[PDB]
Amino acid sequence: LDFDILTNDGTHRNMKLLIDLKNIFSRQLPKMPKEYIVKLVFDRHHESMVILKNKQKVIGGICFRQYKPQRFAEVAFLAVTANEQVRGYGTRLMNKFKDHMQKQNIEYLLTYADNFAIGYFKKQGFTKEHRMPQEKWKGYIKDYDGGTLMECYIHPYVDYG
Amino acid sequence: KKPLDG
Ligand SMILES: CC(C)(COP(=O)(O)OP(=O)(O)OC[C@H]1O[C@@H](n2cnc3c(N)ncnc32)[C@H](O)[C@@H]1OP(=O)(O)O)[C@@H](O)C(=O)NCCC(=O)NCCS
Say yes or no for a CB contact (<8 Å) between B3 and A111: no
Distance, in angstroms, between A157 CA and closest chain B CA? 28
Q: Say yes or no: CB of residue A61 within 6 Å of ligand 1.
A: no
**Experimental technique of record:** X-ray
- Asked whether A106 and A72 are in contact (CB, 8 A), the reply is yes
User: What angle in degrees, to the nearest 10, is found between the helix axes of A34-41 and A12-28?
Assistant: 140
Give all domains of chain A, ordered by start, each with its CATH number: 1-161 (3.40.630.30)
**Experimental resolution (Å):** 2.2
The Å distance, Cα A117 to ligand 1 centre, comes to: 9
Q: Which of A42, A46, A36 lies closest to A17, judged by CA?
A: A42
A78·B2 Cβ contact <8 A = no
> How far is it, in rounded angstroms, from Cα A55 to Cα A29?
25
